[PDB]
Write a protein that binds this ligand. Structure first.
Ligand SMILES: O=c1c2c(O)cc(O)cc2oc2c(O)ccc(O)c12
Length: 342
Protein backbone atom coordinates (compact mmCIF):
# COMPACT_ATOMS: atom_id res chain seq x y z
CA UNK A 1 0.00 0.00 0.00
CA UNK A 2 1.27 3.43 -1.12
CA UNK A 3 0.89 6.90 0.42
CA UNK A 4 -1.55 5.52 3.03
CA UNK A 5 -3.40 3.87 0.14
CA UNK A 6 -3.97 7.04 -1.94
CA UNK A 7 -1.31 6.32 -4.60
CA UNK A 8 -0.99 3.31 -6.88
CA UNK A 9 2.25 1.62 -7.88
CA UNK A 10 3.22 4.33 -10.43
CA UNK A 11 3.19 7.17 -7.84
CA UNK A 12 -0.14 8.26 -9.41
CA UNK A 13 -2.93 9.40 -7.09
CA UNK A 14 -5.94 7.07 -7.48
CA UNK A 15 -8.61 9.42 -8.83
CA UNK A 16 -12.08 8.59 -7.49
CA UNK A 17 -14.85 10.43 -9.34
CA UNK A 18 -16.86 12.51 -6.87
CA UNK A 19 -14.24 13.08 -4.16
CA UNK A 20 -14.01 16.50 -2.52
CA UNK A 21 -10.75 18.25 -1.68
CA UNK A 22 -10.10 20.91 0.92
CA UNK A 23 -13.87 21.43 0.93
CA UNK A 24 -13.25 23.25 -2.32
CA UNK A 25 -12.73 20.91 -5.29
CA UNK A 26 -15.07 18.16 -6.49
CA UNK A 27 -13.10 15.73 -8.67
CA UNK A 28 -15.15 14.88 -11.75
CA UNK A 29 -13.10 12.59 -13.95
CA UNK A 30 -9.83 11.83 -15.72
CA UNK A 31 -9.08 13.79 -18.86
CA UNK A 32 -5.39 13.29 -19.18
CA UNK A 33 -2.43 11.08 -18.52
CA UNK A 34 1.27 11.47 -19.04
CA UNK A 35 4.64 10.72 -17.58
CA UNK A 36 4.10 13.55 -15.00
CA UNK A 37 0.89 12.06 -13.57
CA UNK A 38 -2.76 12.82 -14.32
CA UNK A 39 -5.14 15.61 -15.28
CA UNK A 40 -8.65 15.69 -13.83
CA UNK A 41 -11.65 17.83 -14.62
CA UNK A 42 -12.83 19.29 -11.30
CA UNK A 43 -15.46 21.72 -10.04
CA UNK A 44 -14.08 24.62 -7.92
CA UNK A 45 -17.05 25.10 -5.61
CA UNK A 46 -15.60 28.35 -4.30
CA UNK A 47 -15.17 30.21 -7.57
CA UNK A 48 -18.09 28.29 -9.10
CA UNK A 49 -16.26 27.04 -12.17
CA UNK A 50 -14.80 23.93 -13.75
CA UNK A 51 -11.02 23.66 -13.57
CA UNK A 52 -8.36 21.30 -14.90
CA UNK A 53 -6.12 19.95 -12.14
CA UNK A 54 -2.77 18.39 -12.96
CA UNK A 55 -1.73 15.85 -10.33
CA UNK A 56 2.04 15.36 -10.42
CA UNK A 57 3.38 11.99 -9.33
CA UNK A 58 4.34 11.52 -5.66
CA UNK A 59 8.04 11.19 -6.47
CA UNK A 60 10.96 13.55 -6.12
CA UNK A 61 12.00 13.96 -9.77
CA UNK A 62 8.57 14.75 -11.19
CA UNK A 63 7.89 17.11 -8.28
CA UNK A 64 11.15 19.00 -8.96
CA UNK A 65 10.28 19.26 -12.68
CA UNK A 66 6.76 20.48 -11.92
CA UNK A 67 8.23 23.03 -9.52
CA UNK A 68 10.14 24.35 -12.55
CA UNK A 69 6.86 24.62 -14.47
CA UNK A 70 5.28 26.55 -11.61
CA UNK A 71 8.01 29.18 -11.38
CA UNK A 72 7.79 29.59 -15.15
CA UNK A 73 4.01 30.10 -15.07
CA UNK A 74 4.27 32.44 -12.07
CA UNK A 75 6.84 34.39 -14.11
CA UNK A 76 4.54 34.55 -17.12
CA UNK A 77 1.61 35.37 -14.87
CA UNK A 78 3.58 38.52 -13.79
CA UNK A 79 3.22 40.21 -17.22
CA UNK A 80 0.63 42.79 -18.39
CA UNK A 81 0.13 42.29 -21.88
CA UNK A 82 -2.35 40.40 -23.59
CA UNK A 83 -0.01 38.18 -25.54
CA UNK A 84 0.04 36.18 -22.22
CA UNK A 85 -3.53 35.25 -23.13
CA UNK A 86 -2.44 32.45 -25.52
CA UNK A 87 -0.65 30.68 -22.67
CA UNK A 88 -2.79 28.49 -20.45
CA UNK A 89 -3.35 30.33 -17.18
CA UNK A 90 -2.23 28.80 -13.86
CA UNK A 91 -5.02 29.52 -11.38
CA UNK A 92 -3.27 28.13 -8.32
CA UNK A 93 -0.97 25.40 -7.04
CA UNK A 94 -0.85 23.55 -3.73
CA UNK A 95 0.26 20.28 -2.16
CA UNK A 96 -2.40 17.62 -1.60
CA UNK A 97 -1.73 14.28 0.10
CA UNK A 98 1.92 14.50 -1.13
CA UNK A 99 1.18 15.48 -4.78
CA UNK A 100 1.91 18.88 -6.25
CA UNK A 101 -1.27 19.98 -8.05
CA UNK A 102 -1.62 22.64 -10.71
CA UNK A 103 -5.04 24.19 -11.16
CA UNK A 104 -5.61 25.53 -14.65
CA UNK A 105 -8.40 27.18 -16.51
CA UNK A 106 -10.49 24.44 -18.09
CA UNK A 107 -10.16 24.21 -21.90
CA UNK A 108 -11.43 21.97 -24.72
CA UNK A 109 -9.74 19.50 -26.94
CA UNK A 110 -6.35 19.76 -28.45
CA UNK A 111 -5.48 20.19 -32.11
CA UNK A 112 -4.66 16.54 -32.63
CA UNK A 113 -8.23 15.77 -31.57
CA UNK A 114 -9.44 18.43 -33.99
CA UNK A 115 -7.52 16.66 -36.80
CA UNK A 116 -9.16 13.29 -36.00
CA UNK A 117 -12.65 14.81 -36.16
CA UNK A 118 -11.84 15.72 -39.79
CA UNK A 119 -10.62 12.13 -40.49
CA UNK A 120 -7.11 13.50 -41.02
CA UNK A 121 -8.11 15.61 -44.03
CA UNK A 122 -7.01 18.71 -42.18
CA UNK A 123 -8.61 22.03 -41.47
CA UNK A 124 -8.83 24.87 -43.96
CA UNK A 125 -5.98 27.25 -44.69
CA UNK A 126 -8.14 29.97 -43.09
CA UNK A 127 -8.37 28.10 -39.84
CA UNK A 128 -4.64 27.37 -40.07
CA UNK A 129 -3.92 31.04 -40.63
CA UNK A 130 -5.79 31.93 -37.41
CA UNK A 131 -3.95 29.17 -35.53
CA UNK A 132 -0.65 30.36 -36.95
CA UNK A 133 -1.24 33.92 -35.88
CA UNK A 134 -2.22 33.03 -32.32
CA UNK A 135 0.83 30.73 -32.03
CA UNK A 136 3.36 33.28 -33.29
CA UNK A 137 1.93 35.79 -30.88
CA UNK A 138 2.34 33.22 -28.09
CA UNK A 139 5.93 32.58 -29.14
CA UNK A 140 6.52 36.33 -29.24
CA UNK A 141 5.31 36.46 -25.67
CA UNK A 142 7.76 33.79 -24.65
CA UNK A 143 10.62 35.58 -26.37
CA UNK A 144 10.29 38.79 -24.32
CA UNK A 145 13.69 39.00 -22.59
CA UNK A 146 12.63 38.70 -18.96
CA UNK A 147 11.14 35.28 -19.81
CA UNK A 148 13.12 33.80 -22.74
CA UNK A 149 11.24 30.53 -22.35
CA UNK A 150 11.59 27.53 -24.65
CA UNK A 151 8.42 25.49 -24.46
CA UNK A 152 10.48 22.53 -25.73
CA UNK A 153 7.50 20.34 -26.55
CA UNK A 154 5.20 21.97 -29.08
CA UNK A 155 2.92 19.61 -30.99
CA UNK A 156 -0.83 19.44 -31.77
CA UNK A 157 -1.55 17.71 -28.42
CA UNK A 158 -0.21 20.71 -26.43
CA UNK A 159 -2.25 23.29 -28.34
CA UNK A 160 -5.83 23.26 -26.99
CA UNK A 161 -8.97 25.03 -28.18
CA UNK A 162 -10.54 27.38 -25.65
CA UNK A 163 -14.05 26.42 -26.64
CA UNK A 164 -15.03 23.77 -29.22
CA UNK A 165 -16.93 26.28 -31.40
CA UNK A 166 -14.46 29.22 -31.60
CA UNK A 167 -10.84 29.13 -32.89
CA UNK A 168 -9.07 30.65 -29.88
CA UNK A 169 -6.19 28.38 -28.72
CA UNK A 170 -3.86 28.35 -25.74
CA UNK A 171 -0.57 26.51 -25.34
CA UNK A 172 -0.42 24.01 -22.45
CA UNK A 173 2.15 21.80 -20.70
CA UNK A 174 5.23 23.73 -19.66
CA UNK A 175 6.64 20.67 -17.85
CA UNK A 176 9.59 20.24 -20.22
CA UNK A 177 10.04 24.03 -20.53
CA UNK A 178 13.20 26.04 -19.73
CA UNK A 179 14.54 29.58 -19.79
CA UNK A 180 17.51 30.36 -21.99
CA UNK A 181 19.42 30.10 -18.82
CA UNK A 182 18.46 26.59 -17.76
CA UNK A 183 18.71 23.24 -19.79
CA UNK A 184 18.92 19.81 -20.52
CA UNK A 185 18.45 16.88 -22.14
CA UNK A 186 19.29 17.38 -25.71
CA UNK A 187 16.60 14.87 -26.40
CA UNK A 188 13.73 17.24 -26.19
CA UNK A 189 10.66 17.88 -28.39
CA UNK A 190 8.65 14.95 -29.72
CA UNK A 191 10.42 13.31 -32.62
CA UNK A 192 8.15 14.57 -35.46
CA UNK A 193 8.65 18.16 -34.29
CA UNK A 194 12.28 18.01 -33.24
CA UNK A 195 14.48 20.80 -34.58
CA UNK A 196 17.59 19.79 -36.52
CA UNK A 197 19.90 21.54 -34.17
CA UNK A 198 18.50 19.30 -31.42
CA UNK A 199 18.98 16.19 -33.48
CA UNK A 200 22.60 17.13 -34.19
CA UNK A 201 23.23 17.84 -30.52
CA UNK A 202 23.91 21.53 -31.04
CA UNK A 203 23.02 24.28 -28.57
CA UNK A 204 19.39 25.28 -28.97
CA UNK A 205 17.51 28.45 -28.04
CA UNK A 206 13.94 29.74 -28.46
CA UNK A 207 14.22 29.09 -32.15
CA UNK A 208 13.45 25.37 -31.74
CA UNK A 209 9.82 26.16 -30.89
CA UNK A 210 9.55 27.97 -34.19
CA UNK A 211 10.62 24.80 -36.02
CA UNK A 212 7.90 22.82 -34.24
CA UNK A 213 5.38 25.49 -35.27
CA UNK A 214 6.45 25.10 -38.90
CA UNK A 215 5.69 21.35 -38.79
CA UNK A 216 2.46 21.84 -36.84
CA UNK A 217 0.92 24.29 -39.33
CA UNK A 218 1.66 22.02 -42.32
CA UNK A 219 0.18 19.03 -40.45
CA UNK A 220 -2.90 21.04 -39.48
CA UNK A 221 -3.62 21.82 -43.14
CA UNK A 222 -2.70 18.47 -44.76
CA UNK A 223 -3.80 16.24 -41.88
CA UNK A 224 -0.59 14.24 -41.71
CA UNK A 225 2.78 14.85 -40.05
CA UNK A 226 5.17 16.59 -42.36
CA UNK A 227 8.21 14.64 -41.06
CA UNK A 228 7.13 11.34 -39.40
CA UNK A 229 10.47 9.91 -38.28
CA UNK A 230 10.25 6.57 -36.50
CA UNK A 231 13.67 7.38 -34.91
CA UNK A 232 16.36 10.06 -35.02
CA UNK A 233 17.98 8.72 -38.21
CA UNK A 234 14.62 8.41 -40.03
CA UNK A 235 13.64 11.88 -38.71
CA UNK A 236 16.68 13.61 -40.23
CA UNK A 237 16.20 11.67 -43.40
CA UNK A 238 12.55 12.71 -43.78
CA UNK A 239 13.66 16.33 -43.20
CA UNK A 240 16.36 16.01 -45.87
CA UNK A 241 13.88 14.68 -48.43
CA UNK A 242 12.24 18.12 -48.19
CA UNK A 243 14.90 20.69 -47.32
CA UNK A 244 18.02 19.11 -48.79
CA UNK A 245 21.34 18.73 -47.03
CA UNK A 246 21.96 21.16 -44.15
CA UNK A 247 24.47 23.95 -44.82
CA UNK A 248 28.08 22.87 -44.56
CA UNK A 249 28.99 25.56 -42.05
CA UNK A 250 26.39 24.20 -39.63
CA UNK A 251 27.34 20.58 -40.09
CA UNK A 252 30.99 21.54 -39.57
CA UNK A 253 30.11 22.27 -35.94
CA UNK A 254 27.49 19.57 -35.29
CA UNK A 255 28.67 17.04 -32.63
CA UNK A 256 26.35 14.38 -34.14
CA UNK A 257 26.71 15.34 -37.81
CA UNK A 258 28.42 12.01 -38.57
CA UNK A 259 25.44 10.17 -37.13
CA UNK A 260 23.64 11.14 -40.37
CA UNK A 261 26.13 12.51 -42.95
CA UNK A 262 29.49 11.58 -44.46
CA UNK A 263 32.02 14.34 -45.11
CA UNK A 264 33.35 13.69 -48.57
CA UNK A 265 37.15 13.98 -49.06
CA UNK A 266 36.59 17.39 -50.78
CA UNK A 267 34.86 18.74 -47.63
CA UNK A 268 31.24 18.77 -48.80
CA UNK A 269 28.61 16.79 -46.93
CA UNK A 270 26.31 14.04 -48.08
CA UNK A 271 24.06 11.42 -46.60
CA UNK A 272 25.40 8.03 -45.64
CA UNK A 273 24.78 4.42 -46.75
CA UNK A 274 17.74 -0.87 -49.93
CA UNK A 275 14.69 1.33 -50.65
CA UNK A 276 16.29 4.72 -50.78
CA UNK A 277 14.94 7.97 -49.49
CA UNK A 278 13.99 10.55 -51.95
CA UNK A 279 16.92 12.63 -53.26
CA UNK A 280 17.61 15.65 -51.04
CA UNK A 281 15.09 18.41 -51.67
CA UNK A 282 12.84 16.42 -54.01
CA UNK A 283 9.67 15.96 -51.98
CA UNK A 284 8.87 19.61 -52.41
CA UNK A 285 6.60 21.40 -49.94
CA UNK A 286 4.97 22.78 -53.11
CA UNK A 287 3.50 19.32 -53.77
CA UNK A 288 2.76 18.43 -50.18
CA UNK A 289 0.60 21.57 -49.91
CA UNK A 290 -0.92 21.16 -53.39
CA UNK A 291 -0.16 24.81 -54.28
CA UNK A 292 -1.41 24.47 -57.86
CA UNK A 293 -3.71 21.44 -57.66
CA UNK A 294 -6.35 22.51 -55.15
CA UNK A 295 -4.50 22.33 -51.84
CA UNK A 296 -4.09 19.06 -49.99
CA UNK A 297 -6.21 16.29 -51.48
CA UNK A 298 -7.46 18.50 -54.27
CA UNK A 299 -10.20 19.28 -51.80
CA UNK A 300 -9.84 23.15 -51.83
CA UNK A 301 -10.12 24.06 -55.53
CA UNK A 302 -11.87 27.39 -55.72
CA UNK A 303 -12.17 27.95 -52.00
CA UNK A 304 -11.57 31.38 -50.76
CA UNK A 305 -8.29 32.10 -48.98
CA UNK A 306 -6.85 29.10 -50.94
CA UNK A 307 -5.89 30.83 -54.20
CA UNK A 308 -2.52 29.78 -55.57
CA UNK A 309 -1.43 33.17 -54.25
CA UNK A 310 -2.45 32.34 -50.67
CA UNK A 311 -0.65 28.98 -50.96
CA UNK A 312 2.58 30.57 -52.15
CA UNK A 313 2.47 32.93 -49.18
CA UNK A 314 1.93 29.89 -46.89
CA UNK A 315 4.81 27.90 -48.36
CA UNK A 316 7.05 30.94 -47.99
CA UNK A 317 6.16 31.33 -44.36
CA UNK A 318 6.69 27.63 -43.58
CA UNK A 319 10.09 27.49 -45.32
CA UNK A 320 11.15 30.50 -43.26
CA UNK A 321 10.11 28.46 -40.25
CA UNK A 322 11.92 25.35 -41.50
CA UNK A 323 15.20 27.20 -41.96
CA UNK A 324 18.09 24.92 -40.98
CA UNK A 325 20.03 27.89 -39.59
CA UNK A 326 18.60 28.77 -36.14
CA UNK A 327 20.06 32.25 -36.26
CA UNK A 328 18.13 33.11 -39.47
CA UNK A 329 14.94 31.13 -38.92
CA UNK A 330 12.09 33.59 -38.88
CA UNK A 331 11.46 35.00 -35.44
CA UNK A 332 8.03 35.68 -33.87
CA UNK A 333 7.81 39.43 -34.48
CA UNK A 334 8.57 38.99 -38.19
CA UNK A 335 6.39 35.95 -38.78
CA UNK A 336 3.48 38.24 -37.85
CA UNK A 337 4.58 40.79 -40.53
CA UNK A 338 4.43 38.11 -43.24
CA UNK A 339 1.94 38.50 -46.07
CA UNK A 340 0.28 35.25 -44.99
CA UNK A 341 -1.46 37.27 -42.24
CA UNK A 342 -2.13 40.74 -43.76
O1 LIG B 1 -2.12 22.00 -18.68
C1 LIG B 1 -2.96 21.03 -19.24
C2 LIG B 1 -4.42 21.25 -19.48
C3 LIG B 1 -5.06 22.45 -19.19
O2 LIG B 1 -4.23 23.43 -18.65
C4 LIG B 1 -6.44 22.56 -19.46
C5 LIG B 1 -7.11 21.47 -20.01
O3 LIG B 1 -8.47 21.51 -20.33
C6 LIG B 1 -6.45 20.31 -20.30
C7 LIG B 1 -5.12 20.19 -20.04
O4 LIG B 1 -4.55 18.95 -20.36
C8 LIG B 1 -3.18 18.68 -20.17
C9 LIG B 1 -2.59 17.44 -20.51
O5 LIG B 1 -3.40 16.43 -21.07
C10 LIG B 1 -1.26 17.24 -20.28
C11 LIG B 1 -0.52 18.21 -19.74
C12 LIG B 1 -1.02 19.43 -19.40
O6 LIG B 1 -0.14 20.36 -18.86
C13 LIG B 1 -2.39 19.73 -19.60
Amino acid sequence: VYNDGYDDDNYDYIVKNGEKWMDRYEIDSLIGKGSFGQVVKAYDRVEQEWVAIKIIKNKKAFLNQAQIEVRLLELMNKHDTEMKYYIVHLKRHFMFRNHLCLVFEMLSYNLYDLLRNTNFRGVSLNLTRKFAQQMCTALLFLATPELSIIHCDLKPENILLCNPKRSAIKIVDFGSSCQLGQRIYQYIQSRFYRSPEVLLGMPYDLAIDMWSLGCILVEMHTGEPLFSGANEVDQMNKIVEVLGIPPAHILDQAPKARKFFEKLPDGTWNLKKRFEYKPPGTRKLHNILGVETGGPGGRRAGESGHTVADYLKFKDLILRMLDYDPKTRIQPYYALQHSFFK
